[PDB]
Scaffold this motif. Structure first.
Motif, PDB file in Angstrom:
ATOM      1  N   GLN A  68      -9.592 111.941  24.637  1.00 53.26           N
ATOM      2  CA  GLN A  68      -8.829 111.833  23.391  1.00 53.26           C
ATOM      3  C   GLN A  68      -8.996 113.076  22.541  1.00 53.26           C
ATOM      4  O   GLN A  68     -10.071 113.672  22.511  1.00 53.26           O
ATOM      5  CB  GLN A  68      -9.293 110.626  22.572  1.00 53.26           C
ATOM      6  CG  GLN A  68      -8.917 109.293  23.154  1.00 53.26           C
ATOM      7  CD  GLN A  68      -9.440 108.114  22.339  1.00 53.26           C
ATOM      8  OE1 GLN A  68      -9.193 106.958  22.685  1.00 53.26           O
ATOM      9  NE2 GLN A  68     -10.160 108.398  21.258  1.00 53.26           N
TER      10      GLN A  68
ATOM     11  N   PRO B 268      -1.483 106.296  29.665  1.00 56.07           N
ATOM     12  CA  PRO B 268      -2.074 105.084  29.085  1.00 56.07           C
ATOM     13  C   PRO B 268      -1.003 104.092  28.655  1.00 56.07           C
ATOM     14  O   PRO B 268      -1.173 102.885  28.792  1.00 56.07           O
ATOM     15  CB  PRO B 268      -2.881 105.630  27.912  1.00 56.07           C
ATOM     16  CG  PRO B 268      -3.323 106.975  28.443  1.00 56.07           C
ATOM     17  CD  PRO B 268      -2.047 107.509  29.042  1.00 56.07           C
TER      18      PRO B 268
ATOM     19  N   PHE C  73      -9.743 112.563  31.487  1.00 54.23           N
ATOM     20  CA  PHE C  73      -9.032 112.213  30.263  1.00 54.23           C
ATOM     21  C   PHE C  73      -9.952 112.200  29.042  1.00 54.23           C
ATOM     22  O   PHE C  73     -11.045 111.622  29.064  1.00 54.23           O
ATOM     23  CB  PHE C  73      -8.403 110.837  30.390  1.00 54.23           C
ATOM     24  CG  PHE C  73      -7.315 110.758  31.396  1.00 54.23           C
ATOM     25  CD1 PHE C  73      -7.594 110.844  32.747  1.00 54.23           C
ATOM     26  CD2 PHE C  73      -6.013 110.546  30.995  1.00 54.23           C
ATOM     27  CE1 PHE C  73      -6.598 110.708  33.681  1.00 54.23           C
ATOM     28  CE2 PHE C  73      -5.005 110.409  31.925  1.00 54.23           C
ATOM     29  CZ  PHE C  73      -5.301 110.488  33.276  1.00 54.23           C
TER      30      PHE C  73
ATOM     31  N   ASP D 231     -12.486 103.503  33.976  1.00 53.45           N
ATOM     32  CA  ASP D 231     -11.802 103.444  32.692  1.00 53.45           C
ATOM     33  C   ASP D 231     -11.328 104.864  32.416  1.00 53.45           C
ATOM     34  O   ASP D 231     -11.775 105.806  33.070  1.00 53.45           O
ATOM     35  CB  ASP D 231     -12.762 102.984  31.586  1.00 53.45           C
ATOM     36  CG  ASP D 231     -13.819 104.028  31.256  1.00 53.45           C
ATOM     37  OD1 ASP D 231     -14.612 104.400  32.149  1.00 53.45           O
ATOM     38  OD2 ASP D 231     -13.851 104.480  30.093  1.00 53.45           O
ATOM     39  N   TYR D 232     -10.431 105.025  31.453  1.00 50.90           N
ATOM     40  CA  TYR D 232      -9.937 106.353  31.129  1.00 50.90           C
ATOM     41  C   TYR D 232     -11.051 107.310  30.757  1.00 50.90           C
ATOM     42  O   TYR D 232     -10.827 108.512  30.594  1.00 50.90           O
ATOM     43  CB  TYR D 232      -8.903 106.294  30.009  1.00 50.90           C
ATOM     44  CG  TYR D 232      -7.591 105.732  30.478  1.00 50.90           C
ATOM     45  CD1 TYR D 232      -7.295 104.383  30.332  1.00 50.90           C
ATOM     46  CD2 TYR D 232      -6.663 106.542  31.108  1.00 50.90           C
ATOM     47  CE1 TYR D 232      -6.104 103.861  30.799  1.00 50.90           C
ATOM     48  CE2 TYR D 232      -5.476 106.031  31.581  1.00 50.90           C
ATOM     49  CZ  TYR D 232      -5.197 104.691  31.424  1.00 50.90           C
ATOM     50  OH  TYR D 232      -4.008 104.188  31.895  1.00 50.90           O
ATOM     51  N   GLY D 233     -12.263 106.779  30.640  1.00 54.04           N
ATOM     52  CA  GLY D 233     -13.400 107.612  30.303  1.00 54.04           C
ATOM     53  C   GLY D 233     -13.927 108.370  31.503  1.00 54.04           C
ATOM     54  O   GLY D 233     -14.394 109.494  31.357  1.00 54.04           O
TER      55      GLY D 233
ATOM     56  N   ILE E 111      -3.653 112.845  24.506  1.00 55.64           N
ATOM     57  CA  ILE E 111      -4.678 112.911  25.535  1.00 55.64           C
ATOM     58  C   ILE E 111      -4.863 114.264  26.195  1.00 55.64           C
ATOM     59  O   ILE E 111      -3.955 114.801  26.818  1.00 55.64           O
ATOM     60  CB  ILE E 111      -4.417 111.888  26.658  1.00 55.64           C
ATOM     61  CG1 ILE E 111      -4.206 110.501  26.067  1.00 55.64           C
ATOM     62  CG2 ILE E 111      -5.613 111.848  27.599  1.00 55.64           C
ATOM     63  CD1 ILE E 111      -5.426 109.987  25.330  1.00 55.64           C
TER      64      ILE E 111
END
Ligand SMILES: C[N+](C)(CCCS(=O)(=O)[O-])Cc1ccccc1
Length: 460
Positions: free
Chosen positions: A379, A222, A377, A366-368, A387
């Motif tokens: 959090q 990121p 990924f 998206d990182y989602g 991550i």
């Protein structure tokens, strides 16, 4: 990938290579405990689970090469990426053979379990017969080197692994071209320093992830891909779609670094021996080859820059961050870009680019929902800046249902747990429960979630 010549090994003076016809995979004691569809890949023409002819679909990857030459954009791509690599100050000189075999900083020691390739595989000679890691002796290895020399043919092995039912009936089995240890050593002595530099520097300067540790590297992605977005996509038969021009471009990059620009061509114009057939391929990269991860990433680095310049004007390459691991690539740009449009620029080169994760259309990511090295990924709960690399729980369930070596279930399980816990406490706890539901799984050691979590924080 274009097959140039194909002929009997007898008409060329080569032996017939014998390859495993039956899978070593068998149902594990967890087969009924977890859900799964995957099963052993087809390894023989005579598999009732088949529909189409084996040899047919097997050698279908070679569509041939699309007519195209080098253009200014590729030249620009090569130029920029070279300049990027020039900042790492990579030593062009070869490495001592002692380092090629037992390794050095950034370069893992040679695997002494995998086959030695041609012609040792036909002489009953294994790697441990040439290398004595116990006394670091390699005298027998040197003799072999001078005896059979280099540029030996690659051995084609069928990949014995789990696959989806549709790949079973379609006879879509993956192949693994095994290079001769003689050529693996040559490639390491020559490029060794480059391989080393890359492994120690996974990121956006090398534009590569080979050598990284997902557990800590995921937190860094990121920060490196600091763009207006993040893009990923799939390649349809990447290995067999690499046109010779990309090798020519790869050579230029290597030449700008003062490395041998021709050796790699032995991967472009490669020699192979399937079973009783010897053949030569023009174009494409040898799948599963020894040290091709890095070369594939570099090619992808050159490809991504080209397609972007091809699809857009007023592009600032310096703002296009790329991280590649072979054919798997994720990148970003200062501004938003259309993945579909970038994809279409690949057509002219013979590259088929489809939506990420076998999706329907080229949707924004998206990182989602994005994935890389087959990992998502997520959090961390306690520290949002760390991550978690998430691995598909379905894949883990699939894997645990089969085993190649029963007396090694402990090792197999441990591997899965290290992938699993990253998906969360609840999921991991359910995983532990199912395993411990039978006596055989109760006798196994399963690392507690607290222990794994504790060890993970200490890696940063
Ligand atoms: C990379 N971030 C710093 C911001 C990404 C915003 S997004 O959720 O719209 O992709 C953190 C992050 C957010 C969600 C998942 C994993 C990491």
């Amino acid at each position: 990938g274009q097959i140039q010549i194909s002929k009997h090994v007898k008409d060329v003076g080569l032996p017939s290579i014998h390859t495993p016809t039956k899978t070593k995979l068998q149902p594990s004691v967890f087969y009924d405990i977890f859900p799964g569809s995957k099963e052993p890949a087809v390894l023989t023409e005579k598999d009732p689970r088949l529909k189409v002819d084996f040899d047919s679909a097997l050698f279908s990857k070679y569509k041939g090469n699309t007519e195209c030459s080098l253009n200014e954009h590729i030249q620009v791509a090569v130029a920029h990426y070279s300049a990027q690599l020039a900042t790492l100050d990579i030593d062009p000189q070869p490495i001592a053979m002692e380092d090629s075999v037992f390794g050095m900083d950034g370069l893992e020691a040679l695997d002494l379990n995998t086959s030695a390739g041609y012609p040792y595989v036909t002489l009953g000679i294994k790697k441990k017969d040439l290398i004595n890691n116990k006394t670091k002796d390699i005298s027998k290895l040197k003799l072999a080197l001078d005896k059979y020399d280099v540029d030996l043919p690659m051995i084609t092995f069928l990949k014995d692994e789990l696959r989806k039912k549709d790949k079973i009936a379609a006879g879509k089995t993956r192949v693994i071209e095994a290079s001769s240890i003689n050529d693996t050593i040559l490639f390491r002595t020559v490029y060794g320093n480059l391989f080393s530099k890359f492994h120690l520097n996974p990121g956006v300067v090398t534009g590569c992830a080979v050598g990284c540790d997902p557990e800590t590297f995921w937190s860094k992605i990121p920060l490196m891909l600091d763009g207006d977005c993040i893009m990923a996509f799939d390649y349809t038969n990447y290995d067999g779609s690499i046109h010779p021009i990309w090798f020519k471009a790869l050579g230029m990059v290597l030449d700008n670094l003062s490395f041998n620009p021709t050796l790699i061509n032995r991967l472009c114009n490669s020699k192979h021996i399937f079973k009783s057939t010897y053949y030569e391929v023009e174009g494409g990269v040898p799948s599963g080859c020894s040290g091709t991860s890095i070369f594939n990433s570099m090619i992808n680095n050159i490809i991504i820059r080209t397609l972007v310049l091809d699809a857009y004007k007023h592009i600032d390459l310096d703002k296009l961050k790329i991280i590649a691991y072979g054919d798997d690539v994720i990148f970003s740009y200062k501004y938003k870009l259309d993945m579909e449009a970038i994809a279409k620029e690949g057509q002219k080169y013979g590259l088929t680019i489809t939506p990420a994760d076998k999706s329907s259309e080229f949707k924004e990511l998206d990182y989602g929902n994005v994935t890389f090295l087959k990992r998502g990924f997520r959090q961390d709960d306690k520290y949002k800046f760390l991550i978690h690399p998430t691995f598909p729980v379905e894949e883990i369930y699939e894997s645990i249902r089969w085993t190649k070596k029963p007396s090694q279930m402990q090792e197999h399980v441990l591997s899965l747990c290290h992938l699993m816990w990253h998906n969360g406490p609840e999921i991991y706890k359910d995983f532990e429960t199912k395993i411990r539901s039978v006596s055989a799984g109760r006798a196994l050691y399963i690392p507690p979630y607290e222990l794994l979590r504790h060890e993970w924080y200490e890696k940063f």
